[PDB]
Amino acid sequence: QPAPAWTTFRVGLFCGIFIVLNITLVLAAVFKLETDRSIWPLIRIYRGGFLLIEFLFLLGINTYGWRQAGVNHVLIFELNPRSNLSHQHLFEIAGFLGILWCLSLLACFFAPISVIPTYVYPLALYGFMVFFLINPTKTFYYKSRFWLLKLLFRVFTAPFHKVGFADFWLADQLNSLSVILMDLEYMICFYSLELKWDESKGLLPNNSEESGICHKYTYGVRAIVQCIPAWLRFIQCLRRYRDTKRAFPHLVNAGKYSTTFFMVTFAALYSTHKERGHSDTMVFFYLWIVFYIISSCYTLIWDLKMDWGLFDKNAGENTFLREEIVYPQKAYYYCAIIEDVILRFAWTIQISITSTTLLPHSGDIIATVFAPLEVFRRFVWNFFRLENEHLNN
Amino acid sequence: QPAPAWTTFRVGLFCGIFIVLNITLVLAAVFKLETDRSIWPLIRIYRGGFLLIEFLFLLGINTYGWRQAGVNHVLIFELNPRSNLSHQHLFEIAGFLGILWCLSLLACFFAPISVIPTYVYPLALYGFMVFFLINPTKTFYYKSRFWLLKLLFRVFTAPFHKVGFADFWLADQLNSLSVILMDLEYMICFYSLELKWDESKGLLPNNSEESGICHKYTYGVRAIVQCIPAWLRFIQCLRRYRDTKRAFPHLVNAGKYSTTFFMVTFAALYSTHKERGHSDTMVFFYLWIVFYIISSCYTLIWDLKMDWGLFDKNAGENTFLREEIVYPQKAYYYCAIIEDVILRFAWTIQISITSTTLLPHSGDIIATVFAPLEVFRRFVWNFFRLENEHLNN
Numbered sequence A, B: 001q002p003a004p005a006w007t008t009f010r011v012g013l014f015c016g017i018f019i020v021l022n023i024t025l026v027l028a029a030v031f032k033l034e035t036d037r038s039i040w041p042l043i044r045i046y047r048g049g050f051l052l053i054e055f056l057f058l059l060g061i062n063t064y065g066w067r068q069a070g071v072n073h074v075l076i077f078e079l080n081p082r083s084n085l086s087h088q089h090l091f092e093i094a095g096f097l098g099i100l101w102c103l104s105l106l107a108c109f110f111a112p113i114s115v116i117p118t119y120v121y122p123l124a125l126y127g128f129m130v131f132f133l134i135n136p137t138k139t140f141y142y143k144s145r146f147w148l149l150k151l152l153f154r155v156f157t158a159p160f161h162k163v164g165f166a167d168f169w170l171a172d173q174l175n176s177l178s179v180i181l182m183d184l185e186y187m188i189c190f191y192s193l194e195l196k197w198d199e200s201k202g203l204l205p206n207n208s209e210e211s212g213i214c215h216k217y218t219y220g221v222r223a224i225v226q227c228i229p230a231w232l233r234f235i236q237c238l239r240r241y242r243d244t245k246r247a248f249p250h251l252v253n254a255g256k257y258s259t260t261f262f263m264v265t266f267a268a269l270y271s272t273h274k275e276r277g278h279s280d281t282m283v284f285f286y287l288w289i290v291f292y293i294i295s296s297c298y299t300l301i302w303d304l305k306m307d308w309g310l311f312d313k314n315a316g317e318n319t320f321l322r323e324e325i326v327y328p329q330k331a332y333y334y335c336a337i338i339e340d341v342i343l344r345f346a347w348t349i350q351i352s353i354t355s356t357t358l359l360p361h362s363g364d365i366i367a368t369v370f371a372p373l374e375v376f377r378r379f380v381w382n383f384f385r386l387e388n389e390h391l392n393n
């Protein structure tokens, strides 16, 4: 059933406002903003919002593809059939939130008029977003927000509730998008300790020794925020093994999700060795590389053989694929296989660099450039994971 | 017949882009613009264009009414029953033209590229409109523009072609769009006579007494271009009388459309005799005024008693109305009558400032604020005229 023209009109309106706002924001950044003042904290704060907008748009594309390809994903997700969301609603939500984000960024740049210079706009934007998430009224897709909040509650207390499809799907989705979590942690420490709240102007060049508290790992305020999604998925699979008493898949998933834990603690140990300047620190590098390989070379085999269900013995004419495929063109499969091996190494490198406090001058730029790539990798992963899930049933 | 979702998406996209472009144009005009060169000529190059876009948008709303009020207008317009242009197409065309107009105005305000300083933007925009109008390729509503061009040719050759509903409909609509003609004539006069083309931008104030060659009537070229639509309608109704062999509803129409000839000739004579001296100018001003009440009354009785078929001697329950009506609210009819009475006599209000102020450049500002009001008067007149034609047919 086609959606009413009002929904499409709203989607187009929001898309056009988003496009024009992006163009004028780029122009203002190129011309108005001056290079002398450091602008890295602004990008660090707004990266999470941009990632959320991109994820919402990509999920709209994903549900479009699932609807067109013939995948019965409403039964797989166990959603209520009589109230389901098409791509247009997700597009509208993403456009509205993106317009709000662009308005906040433009206000932060220009700062039209206020007494408090610039440090109320990110707080305002994130507060508006969280209020939209947990608004107690019965409007603005109340059923969807209620379902998502219940799913979040089930996921974040995973070792107690029975594991379902949506639980692990959202666990993986959070595993890809943890950059929002680290950005939130950075924002929290920066507002709590660094910024001069009872002052004016705002951000200033930092020359004191106490500066850059969020940059350092302190004791543990950095690594655990990195590996929280890994812990969630690890405990989810442990509970699933307990409930099902099946050895192979869950027992290998435990090691798969503990490899990243090992890599993260080893990178933190390398950082504290650099702080200590030990003679064996360079040797400490080599082992990291080893646990780099056993990390990536782990998940790759899980990405193609078990996740997407490729490399089947009964491939037949479909070279390097499975016997049955619902997508029309194999070029998509081959491009996805080619791009996944490229993007996995970049994702692991970004995770290591963000928490290891390495590359002081180029680490932030590397993270900024490579952040909107793991989201696309997950977007590619979703299609084939759900296709294999539908064909398995 | 629901429209495709892509058309609605395009309409929404164009509307959003137009809205944000208007907001940023207003902001630039308030802030970026500097008041050292007389900006009034700029308005006279753009004002008319604005009106055109406005008209198109208004026309869209009009046809929507005829689809919901039951006023069958395709049958009486002699349009193709199986091929019609819905209001969404008019909305998107108006949005496209408005986006181009806003882009040209912003480029003129900012002057980004320092090679073609200022004079190419208006010519380029109006040329774009021209090539869109007369594009020979079978793209972008080929039937629509071909029909419009054929009807324009039929209208402009009034004394020879047979009269129809669409011909005098377009003549009546054009009778409220002479402002486009005066602005086009002024643009041509400015670009041909007084502009020094070998100059960048042209940041020279026009306060010098040598200016005003194309502002005044002088040799009498504004009067004829102003009276052209009146002449077309006068000749069309003369031909209607000649064909019908009856003069009850036609000769009085000829007199009504000929009163404006005396109107404009008296106005032009007063304007051209003001600077000569001519101490008897008050007699001409009095004649101009009395002809003003004569014409503004004649038009009022024609619009009320005969055009809409209102004030019938036998009305019944519906006081001061007709017998059969299709629109639900009587408040709509009363508001339309009141606003028609105000707008037809609006000139009086203007003259008050022109008779009670010493502010330099007084007539032009009142003229440009009152210009987007005759279009609205025609837009509201169209509803009831089409309804009465449908009832009579």
Ligand SMILES: CC(C)CCC[C@@H](C)[C@H]1CC[C@H]2[C@@H]3CC=C4C[C@@H](OC(=O)CCC(=O)O)CC[C@]4(C)[C@H]3CC[C@]12C
Residues within 6 Å of the ligand: A065, A068, A069, A327, A328, A332, A333, A335, A336, A338, A339, A380, A383
């Ligand atoms: C970075 C380079 C080296 C590779 C980039 C790969 C992507 C651009 C490709 C890989 C997988 C592709 C997707 C694979 C499957 C689909 C489903 C497909 O849905 C349908 O319309 C099919 C159903 C039908 O029409 O019968 C639409 C294209 C899409 C989203 C593809 C869009 C383009 C993607 C994301």
Ligand SMILES: CC(C)CCC[C@@H](C)[C@H]1CC[C@H]2[C@@H]3CC=C4C[C@@H](OC(=O)CCC(=O)O)CC[C@]4(C)[C@H]3CC[C@]12C
Residues within 6 Å of the ligand: B064, B065, B068, B069, B327, B328, B332, B333, B335, B336, B339, B380, B383
């Ligand atoms: C601003 C001051 C000077 C008053 C100007 C009057 C306008 C605001 C009024 C006069 C005539 C009105 C119109 C008369 C008839 C209709 C048809 C009507 O038809 C529908 O689409 C609704 C029908 C239904 O759903 O029952 C919609 C409102 C509209 C366009 C009205 C919109 C408001 C108008 C333009």
